[PDB]
Design a protein around this ligand. Structure first.
Ligand SMILES: *[C@@H]1O[C@H](CO)[C@@H](O)[C@H](O)[C@H]1NC(C)=O
Lengths: 50, 50
């Protein structure tokens, strides 16, 4: 999608796979402004948007 | 010479729906027997801590 109409997905009730997104050597940079990228599998959330 | 389910009016306004769950599709008896019953159902519902 584009910035004028961005699609949002509701991914719920599933075990995440942050280990793949952590070490992938495909994206440019992580540099994400929330919580620490390390040990992301320890914390647990209710819902995550896409 | 069979019974078919046609009316599905259980829901009318299909708004933004949250996480849904499905099961394996199957086919029940779908026939009207007379006389005496043969079994009973029991479903205890409870909402504690979500
Ligand atoms: C649908 O969207 C409205 C407007 O954002 C919101 O108030 C409502 O909670 C949503 N319904 C859901 C998430 O089931």
């Amino acid at each position: 999608a584009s910035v004028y109409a961005w699609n949002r997905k509701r991914i719920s009730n599933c075990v995440a796979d942050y280990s793949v997104l952590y070490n992938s050597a495909s994206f440019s940079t992580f540099k994400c402004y929330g919580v620490s990228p390390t040990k992301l599998n320890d914390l647990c959330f209710t819902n995550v948007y896409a | 010479k069979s019974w078919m389910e046609s009316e599905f009016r259980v829901y009318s306004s299909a708004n933004n729906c949250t996480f849904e769950y499905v099961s394996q599709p199957f086919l029940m008896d779908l026939e009207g027997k007379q006389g005496n019953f043969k079994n009973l159902r029991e479903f205890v519902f409870k909402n504690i801590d979500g």
